[PDB]
A = this chain, B = another copy of it.
Amino acid sequence: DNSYKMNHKRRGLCLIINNKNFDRKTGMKTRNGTDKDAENLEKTFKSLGFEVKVYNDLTAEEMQETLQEVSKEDHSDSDCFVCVLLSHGEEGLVYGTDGKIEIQELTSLFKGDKCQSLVGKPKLFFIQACRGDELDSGV
């Protein structure tokens, strides 16, 4: 009642969305260095037991469809689910290659009443993206 059951048949899926190159209409710069992030995450989460799948340069529509497909996959024998988003963003929003999508449009795909095989299981999202225009000058 106090710790998640983490001894299922498999740890579960780690899904990495790695957006580096953006359409010209977005005006967003190329995210040089993000391929090193994706590769580090792959080795790291694989050593923790996860199966790992990387997607690169997805449109906003492709991000929603990919995560929707994952929310319909067979998680019953898994401990948990991990999603990593690497992109540009603003508060509450992340960039596809062609434009923005709300983070809640992605996370809501995995809520209890929509993804039954993950009910009661940890759903972890790691989000590398800006959340606004404010600068922290420190102390």
Mask: chain A, 118-139; 1 = CB below 8 Å from B; 0 = not? 0100000000000000000111
Quick one: closest B residue to A139, CB to CB? B112
Most buried by B among A116, A138, A139: A139
A137 to B113, CA, bound (A): 9
By secondary structure, the A interface counts as: loop
Quick one: closest B residue to A114, CB to CB? B139
Quick one: closest B residue to A137, CB to CB? B113
Interfacial chain B residues near A139, Cβ < 8 Å: 111-113, 116, 119
Interfacial chain B residues near A116, Cβ < 8 Å: 139
Mask: chain A, 47-61; 1 = CB below 8 Å from B; 0 = not? 000000000000000
Mask: chain A, 80-122; 1 = CB below 8 Å from B; 0 = not? 0000000000000000000000000000000111001001000
A103 to B137, CA, bound (A): 21
Chain A residues in contact with chain B, CB under 8 A?
Answer: 111-113, 116, 119, 137-139
Q: What are 8 residue pairs bridging A and B, where the CB atoms are less than 8 Å apart in the complex?
A: A111-B139, A112-B138, A112-B139, A113-B137, A113-B138, A113-B139, A116-B139, A119-B139
5 nearest CB pairs, A to B: A112-B139, A113-B139, A119-B139, A113-B137, A112-B138
Extra contacts besides A111-B139, A112-B138 (6): CB < 8 Å: A112-B139, A113-B137, A113-B138, A113-B139, A116-B139, A119-B139
